[PDB]
Amino acid sequence: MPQPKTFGELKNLPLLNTDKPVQALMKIADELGEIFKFEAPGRVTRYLSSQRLIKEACDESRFDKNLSQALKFVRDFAGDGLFTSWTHEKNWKKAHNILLPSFSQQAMKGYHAMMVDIAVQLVQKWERLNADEHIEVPEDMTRLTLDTIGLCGFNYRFNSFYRDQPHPFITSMVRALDEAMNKLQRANPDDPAYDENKRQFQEDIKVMNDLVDKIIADRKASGEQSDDLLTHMLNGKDPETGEPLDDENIRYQIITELIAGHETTSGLLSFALYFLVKNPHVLQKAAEEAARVLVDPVPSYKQVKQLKYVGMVLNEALRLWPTAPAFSLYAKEDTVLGGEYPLEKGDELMVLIPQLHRDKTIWGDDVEEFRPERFENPSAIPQHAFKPFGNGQRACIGQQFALHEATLVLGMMLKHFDFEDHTNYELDIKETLTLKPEGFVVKAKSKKIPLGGIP
Ligand code: HEM
Fold it and tell me: Taking CA 40 as the corner, what is the angle to CA 38 and CA 46, rounded to the nearest 5 degrees?
C-alpha cells in the first residue's frame, strides 16, 4: 500500500498543514491510486478512492461510521446530536427514530412555506441592486441557508438579509467550527499559545447554548406549535422506548441541524451556479424548465417536484464537488478489503468522495466535464457509485431537505434573472469543514417577473 511524503515524528501530518487539505489529498490520490496510507502521530488512516473498494467499505455488516478527529472536535458543541454520535450510542437510535418523519418527503410539504419566505428575500435583495453592482454568491447562499434552517429548526429569525454583521449566534457558530478544524493541525493542544483560542471557544459555545436553551424553555412555556423541528421534538415519543428526547439533546439536535446543513447546502447552490455560468447551454436548458414549470408568482411544493432538469444539474454539481467531501468508517472485525488489503478490528477508512465520483471505470472517460444528462436515467448508476450524502443508516438525514431547498432556490434564481460571469471567475475552492467556491461573483439582470406575496 502506497504512502505520501513523511516527516519523521510528524509522519504525514504536515502534508495537511495547508488551507486546502482535501484538494491536497485528491492530488495524492491521483498519483498513488485507489488506496493509500496516511499517518499522523498516534493514528493511522487508509484513504479510499475507487468504487471497487468503497462498495466494500459501505457494507454495514463489516464497517460502521467512525467519529473522525474532526467529528470528535465538533462534538464539543454538537454533543450527542445525530451527526456526532456513535451508531450504538442510545441517543443516536432514539433521535434517529424520532426525527426520521421530520425529514421525509411529506415533511417537506410543511417546510415549504418557510423555505419560500427566505427564498423570496434573496430574490428581492437581487432585484434591488443598482446597475453594475454584483453578487457575492457563496455569501448570499449562506445567508439563505442559515436563515432557512433557523425557521425550520426553531422558528427563529436570524434576519441575515438585514445585516452587515451576522447575528451573534452565527458568528459564534462559524468561529467554533473554525476552531474545531484548526485543532486538527495542533501537535501541542495545551501549549499556552492556544489559551486565547480556548477562551474564545468556550465563549462561543455559551453563546450558542444560551440562545437555543432559552428558546426551548420559552417554547415549553408558550405551548406554541410550528412546522419546526423544535415542536416535533417537544411532542415526539420514541417508537421504541416511548420516551421523548430530553431538553439537552433537543438543543444539540438544533445546533446539529445548523452545522450539518447550512454550509453543505450553500456550497451546493454556489457550485451549481458556477457550473451553469461556465456552461451557458446548460444554463439555458435549466432556465427554460424553470420558466415552463414555475408559472405562479410564488412556487408551490408540487411545482418544485417538477423541476427535473434542475435536479439533474444539482446532482452533477454534487458529483464533481461533493460539499462534505469525506466520511470515516471503522472495521467491526478483522477483515480483508478487496481481497488484498488486510484490516484489523478498529482500523479507520476514509472515503474520498470527489475521487469516487471521478472513477473512470464507472462514469467513463469524460468525468471532468459538467454533463447533467448523466443523471437522466438513475437506474444506470451502479450501486455505491454516487455517494454525496454518505452511506446506509448513517447517511445524511437532511438529504430531502437539502435537495428541496436547493431545487426551489435555483429554480427561482433561473426564473427571475439572467446571470453574467463578469470577471471570468477562476475556480478557487475554500475549505472549512466543507467545500465552497471562494470569491465567486456574478451580475444578475432581472427579467422583471412579478414576485407574489407571502403569509
Ligand atoms: C448538499 C447538502 C448536504 C450534503 C452533501 C450532506 C452530506 C452529508 C454526509 C456525507 C453525511 C454523512 C457524514 C458521515 O458519514 O460522517 C451527512 C450526515 C448528516 N447530515 Fe447532511 N448533508 C447535506 C445537507 C444537510 C442538511 C440540509 C441537513 C439538515 C437539515 C443535514 C443533516 C445531517 C445530519 C443530522 C447527518 C447525520 C445523520 C446521522 O448520522 O444520523 N445535512 N450529511
Answer: 25
Which atom number of ligand 1 is nearest to the Cα of residue 402?
27
What is the C-alpha separation between 239 and 90, in angstroms, rounded?
13
Tell me how crowded residue 319 is: count the other CB atoms within 10 A of its CB: 24
The Cα 27–Cα 166 span in angstroms is: 35
Give the mutation target among 108, 149, 264 for probing the ligand 1 site: most ligand atoms within 8 A of CB.
264
Q: Assign domain 1-455 to a CATH class.
A: mainly alpha
* Ordered DSSP codes for 154-194: HS----GGG-SSPPHHHHHHHHHHHHHHHGGG-S-TTSGGG
Q: Which residues are catalytic?
A: 264, 389, 396
CB neighbour class for 323 (10 Å; exposed up to 12, middle 13-18, buried from 19) = buried
H/E run at residue 428? none
Of 59, 5, 57, whose CA–CA distance to 36 is shortest? 5
Cα of 75 vs centre of ligand 1, distance in Å, is 15
Atom of ligand 1 nearest to the CA of 66: 16
CA torsion through residues 153, 158, 161, 165, sign: negative
